[PDB]
Design a protein around this ligand. Structure first.
Ligand SMILES: CC(C)=CCC/C(C)=C/COP(=O)(O)OP(=O)(O)O
Ligand SMILES: CC(C)=CCC/C(C)=C/COP(=O)(O)OP(=O)(O)O
Ligand SMILES: [Mg+2]
Ligand SMILES: [Mg+2]
Ligand SMILES: [Mg+2]
Ligand SMILES: [Mg+2]
Lengths: 317, 297
């Protein structure tokens, strides 16, 4: 009778959720907020609004959405890559546990989704916005999915340079495109689609990330090696040795990646294979320079609409 | 040039994705499809439809949506719960790894969202359906978030019965209400409260049999191994606190925090609930009262 009352009261109302609960579930996410870089992301949005000109109000929601997805994908990525550190501080899963961190990351994907219906009340443009959201999140997952698959099934498949570019288009292009596409759809104005340029951007960004992880270490943790990642320099190297018939160095690269080693001496050995044998770091520094020139020597603004500036500090988005 | 030309063809096209790739990343999910239960969910979708009168085309798409959401939920939940088995089979994360399983499950959440647009060509309705989809998935994660937090940080928070039921309304109620609300919005013809009570009965009976089955044989009482704040455990913990059974309250916590698979230790915990806190009898009677709230409707 009193129990039935309380039950009937419970089931006739919306599920209870307090802000103390919100705070609990938010701890793993809030922890990654301490990580810097929010400005270089924001700067890229700002700079881009000069072409799209979204009403400051609207630009902020787009910004919050982007932040949520970006930070959430990183929380997940660190669990998937078993990373002990991010932007120098301890990763969330190591503090709040893998359980809570996955759940919080996933919760924020859907919170981000909710922020979408607040960009416009126009029913047709709403659909477009959700579709854009849906599609790019699907691409991000396909790309991350292949990145993980090749790493975890090695040495079953060894990606070619081209397979890798297709992976990055999905993986790193997803959020770049998502941000750009939302803005172009909300633009009250602006010229050619700036997507090809945001694509080139994502690509440059990922190779440089793959590059600097090995270079910073050479000149002085190179986690990518410990992770066993088919990064750009590695794909080059594996394909070079197979092509040049260098069986030993090929297998030697495979063996080090498969060790999932934290050993600095072994780490160096692979980098030395990469400098002296396949010259892959040099090859990669070059490849990036050319992608960058495709935007620098863009006189007929085929890709272009300050961008030179972002492109150089791109490593901190 | 050839490189610049190749970079140019790439950036001016949609990302390349093949059925081979699709295939490779669906491995974790295809594995869980083997497991049963799929027909009762359809049976439940079907029964409710005797009321909702949805055309069979649309009913099929709601089923597909719900199955994808549920199975993905299970893939993740087993990672979160460190579960070795599901429906008597090895969990995907132990076969394909935690990384691919987390990615594929999340991938499938978005494939499900993508299917919502196959339900209508009418914008006003579309918007409602997406909102429902969005709202319940937010509820589901809030629920899951408390269940995981209370457990992984025990004894930081000792939930009360009222708190457990709020968690369950979000967590279990989330998928029940998702199906029903989408069906109710597609009806050319609410049962929300009833679906909420069905969810709660569902959850408490599930918690209860996990322990009872093992006390009797039949089951592994894996909830103890997980350290879960189940309905019988929540009753025992508040009963002990309130009745001043310090040692017992503490032994319950200690056993939960062992994450043990020792049968005698789990049996000792269960017998504490049976003879000391009488949490089992209590859960049984509570389940019965709730079942009466329907059968007596
Ligand atoms: C579906 C998900 C979670 C996608 C993640 C997308 C992303 C920004 C990954 C980062 O991994 P990375 O290979 O670029 O390495 P890092 O840790 O340096 O960013
Ligand atoms: C946001 C997420 C992932 C929600 C999970 C939804 C769900 C069905 C969980 C299982 O709970 P349980 O672990 O208590 O039951 P089981 O015995 O099926 O593992
Ligand atoms: Mg990573
Ligand atoms: Mg990664
Ligand atoms: Mg669970
Ligand atoms: Mg579970």
């Amino acid at each position: 009778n009193k129990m039935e009352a309380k039950i009937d009261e419970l089931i006739n109302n919306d599920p209870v959720w307090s802000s103390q609960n919100e705070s609990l579930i938010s701890k793993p996410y809030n922890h990654i907020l301490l990580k810097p870089g929010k400005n270089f992301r924001l700067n890229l949005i700002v700079q881009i609004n000069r072409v799209m000109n979204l009403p400051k109000d609207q630009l902020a929601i787009v910004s919050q959405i982007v932040e949520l997805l970006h930070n959430s994908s990183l929380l997940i990525d660190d669990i998937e890559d078993n990373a002990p550190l991010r932007r120098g501080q301890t990763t969330s899963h190591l503090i709040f546990g893998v359980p809570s961190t996955i759940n919080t990351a996933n919760y924020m994907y859907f919170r981000a989704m909710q922020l979408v219906s607040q960009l416009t009340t126009k029913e047709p443009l709403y659909h477009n916005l959700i579709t854009i959201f849906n599609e790019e999140l699907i691409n991000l997952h396909r790309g991350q999915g292949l990145d993980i698959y090749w790493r975890d099934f090695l040495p079953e498949i060894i990606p070619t340079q081209e397979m890798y570019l297709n992976m990055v288009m999905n993986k790193t292009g997803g959020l770049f495109r998502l941000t750009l596409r939302l803005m172009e759809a909300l633009s009250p104005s602006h010229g050619h689609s700036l997507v090809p340029f945001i694509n080139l951007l994502g690509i440059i960004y990922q190779i440089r990330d793959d590059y600097l992880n090995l270079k910073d270490f050479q000149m002085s943790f190179a986690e990518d090696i410990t992770e066993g990642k088919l990064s750009f320099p590695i794909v080059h190297a594996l394909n070079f040795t197979k092509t040049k018939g260098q069986t030993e160095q090929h297998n030697e690269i495979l063996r080090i990646l498969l060790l999932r080693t934290s050993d600095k001496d072994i780490k160096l050995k692979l980098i030395q294979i990469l400098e002296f044998d396949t010259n892959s770091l040099a090859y990669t520094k070059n490849f990036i320079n050319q992608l960058v020139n495709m935007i620098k020597n863009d006189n007929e603004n085929k890709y272009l609409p300050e961008l030179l500036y972002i492109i150089d500090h791109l490593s901190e988005l």
